[PDB]
Amino acid sequence: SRRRVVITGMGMLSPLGLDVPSSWEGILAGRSGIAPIEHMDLSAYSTRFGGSVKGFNVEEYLSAKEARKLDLFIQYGLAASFQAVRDSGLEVTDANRERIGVSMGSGIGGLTNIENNCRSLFEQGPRRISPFFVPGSIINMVSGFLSIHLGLQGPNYALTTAQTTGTHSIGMAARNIAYGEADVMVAGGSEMAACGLGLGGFGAARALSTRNDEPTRASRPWDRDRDGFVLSDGSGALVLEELEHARARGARIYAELVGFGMSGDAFHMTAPPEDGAGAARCMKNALRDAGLDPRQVDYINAHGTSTPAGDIAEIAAVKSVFGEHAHALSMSSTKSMTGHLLGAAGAVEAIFSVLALRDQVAPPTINLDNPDEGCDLDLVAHEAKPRKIDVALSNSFGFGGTNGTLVFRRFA
Amino acid sequence: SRRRVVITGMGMLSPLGLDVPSSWEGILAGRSGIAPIEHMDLSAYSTRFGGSVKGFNVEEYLSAKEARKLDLFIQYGLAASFQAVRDSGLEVTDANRERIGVSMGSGIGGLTNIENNCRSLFEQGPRRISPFFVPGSIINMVSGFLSIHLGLQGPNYALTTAQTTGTHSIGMAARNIAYGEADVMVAGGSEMAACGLGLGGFGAARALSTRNDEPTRASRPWDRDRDGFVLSDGSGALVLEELEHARARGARIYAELVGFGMSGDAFHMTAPPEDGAGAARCMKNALRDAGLDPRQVDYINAHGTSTPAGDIAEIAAVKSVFGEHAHALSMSSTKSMTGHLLGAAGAVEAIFSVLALRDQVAPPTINLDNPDEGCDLDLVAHEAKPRKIDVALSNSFGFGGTNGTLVFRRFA
Ligand SMILES: c1cc(-c2ccc3c(c2)OCO3)n[nH]1
Numbered sequence A, B: 001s002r003r004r005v006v007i008t009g010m011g012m013l014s015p016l017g018l019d020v021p022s023s024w025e026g027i028l029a030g031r032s033g034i035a036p037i038e039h040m041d042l043s044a045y046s047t048r049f050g051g052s053v054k055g056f057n058v059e060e061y062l063s064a065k066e067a068r069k070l071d072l073f074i075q076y077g078l079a080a081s082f083q084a085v086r087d088s089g090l091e092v093t094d095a096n097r098e099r100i101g102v103s104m105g106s107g108i109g110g111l112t113n114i115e116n117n118c119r120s121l122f123e124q125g126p127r128r129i130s131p132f133f134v135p136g137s138i139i140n141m142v143s144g145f146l147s148i149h150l151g152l153q154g155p156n157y158a159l160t161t162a163q164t165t166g167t168h169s170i171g172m173a174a175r176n177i178a179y180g181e182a183d184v185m186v187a188g189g190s191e192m193a194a195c196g197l198g199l200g201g202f203g204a205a206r207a208l209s210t211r212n213d214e215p216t217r218a219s220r221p222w223d224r225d226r227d228g229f230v231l232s233d234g235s236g237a238l239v240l241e242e243l244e245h246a247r248a249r250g251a252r253i254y255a256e257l258v259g260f261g262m263s264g265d266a267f268h269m270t271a272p273p274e275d276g277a278g279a280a281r282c283m284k285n286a287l288r289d290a291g292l293d294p295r296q297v298d299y300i301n302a303h304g305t306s307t308p309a310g311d312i313a314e315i316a317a318v319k320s321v322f323g324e325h326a327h328a329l330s331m332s333s334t335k336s337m338t339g340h341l342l343g344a345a346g347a348v349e350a351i352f353s354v355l356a357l358r359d360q361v362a363p364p365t366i367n368l369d370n371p372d373e374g375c376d377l378d379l380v381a382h383e384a385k386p387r388k389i390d391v392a393l394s395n396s397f398g399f400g401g402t403n404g405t406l407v408f409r410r411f412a
């Protein structure tokens, strides 16, 4: 019968920092992590900036020997997972290793590695494809490599639900624990889609901001002058743990995960419906799961991608779910600062939602100069808002019309 | 307490046929689906054969327009899903669409599309990349396009656990139903990795059979002369349905899904441990989930990839779990005939496991001319074996040491 799930550790790489506290400092100061991309030449691309991880040192985590075989998205996911496990104080033993699993996902996985191996195949033939190509690129290898390195023998899997991946990964891992399949899960996501195919592919869709001349102002969720999402890289990982298991070892508990919701829009492969009907069904599912009155929601970390249709669909969903209470809660998009980490977006934003609870502060939506038609909620424009937060909601929406919602609340 | 889950519809593309009954006829007749790959210069490659889908007609399912937008692995996953839903007789309505979800996975997803868009990018720069590249390639678009086409609004997600994907997809879909989030799930996987990058990537790891002279004899699980797996394409989809929901509409019920187990080896990135300790924990977990004693198992659909290390680990795991019953059950690898459909393997093998129950027959392990050292179990060498099958297991073991086991039982 259903057990309670708490957050005992968190880990992050973001455009704002190489761990959680440095990233969070940036979030509260309204700092942008968006900058012209340096790691390749983008003059032929319509978008030439993004949220890069700056000065990532893989030798903090892994031998250069192991690191050379692994796509950046895996290195990022391992870095966040190691931070989270360390942060939790958990010790893996013969007695508990069968009860500790991992669910680290990605939307696009090792696209850089695939691209580089395609260049080898085309220029030099199949004999120049790396022996490590497959195991070094495929999305489940964060879960695989973490399990091997720490000896985790519990449920081992990976989700890929595009921009919903991080949220789904954390929610479903919570279900493993809640219904007895595990006592501990490392869950979240990682992404490094900043290669020609990624920047080119999203550019071909006309889905990215093309504000090349002012990249820090590009991500402007709900602003009347928004022109698409900013592509960003990184990872979030949380250690989820059964409550009595956490209490028994004297674990520090950041917050409790009380609700998870899933729904499909069944509308369009890439566009959300204008009324946010699927997002609304998903949040209602999460709130019922948490046994909450919707008026208990204090803070929503929006998906808030800075797309014309996405941002307005979220306002409509929130008004539909919360009615007049929509005007009392605070909703912000931290993508205003971080840009869109795709399959890692829900993971880093779940962490920001837990830290909004710990610190009693709504992070800002930066660049919200001229709220668009109907964007008349408290969107925490420009500056962090200290306020009472008992219950925090994190939303994600993705290609295929796939929605996820997490509900966190303070733990007493 | 927990709801019961039954199988009411199945769908498939495999190297043996363009649907379930044609595929199953091939299996019971010991037919091989393996042949030299066509319309592709494989001169430079060490492996020039595999399990192709032959004569697939996507316009039975999709318009020309919508098929041009979707990688083959998506076309395949949609063909199996449409088949399964048609086979179930289910009627989608406004009253039930919120209770119907999708979990169709893939190990690698749209490699063919990635290869073709790489060519455009390298030859002509980013502006020639298809606008539909991303949504036409990413792994969650079978779940996405299926939900949009049929108006399915329930849980929408996608697993990617390499060669375990199809087993995990069905087991986790079964949990959605058992725990009351959905009444129906379409679940399974699809794969089309037979492009240069696929054949080249596995080839560079030297994980494929190079028996180019005798392709139909290449896949030979537990045979002393095996030299790695055979790469195959296709899809499996099952309609999973809550028992009372199926009975209330007079659904034909093929079998009951009674058990799902997961585990991680936490051993190696690509090889299982010698003793199959991980596969053994996973089978014990699935049997405990089903409330069944090992003695009650009659038939096992092995992973049985034809790798030196993998085949012998599964013998060790079955002897460990089953002890004095290990010789009385029948265990066969249908990969002897289909080859290895990677993320779709667990999907088509769950279907073969359900049909072994329906028809009371253990499919053969073909090419098993000379069992290897300690491969002395009933491996159903050469020809199908009619027998009592009340309980059937389907195992998958993948890169990352990720393990899944499904337990099916006869329904009355
Ligand atoms: C568009 C499609 C993809 C893609 C497709 C399949 C995948 C994947 C990435 O990495 C895993 O195998 N990335 N961008």
Ligand SMILES: c1cc(-c2ccc3c(c2)OCO3)n[nH]1
Residues within 6 Å of the ligand: A175, A176, A179, A181, B172, B175, B176, B177, B179, B180, B181
């Ligand atoms: C693995 C997944 C689940 C699951 C799935 C869906 C659910 C749920 C539990 O509780 C409410 O909706 N349990 N074990």
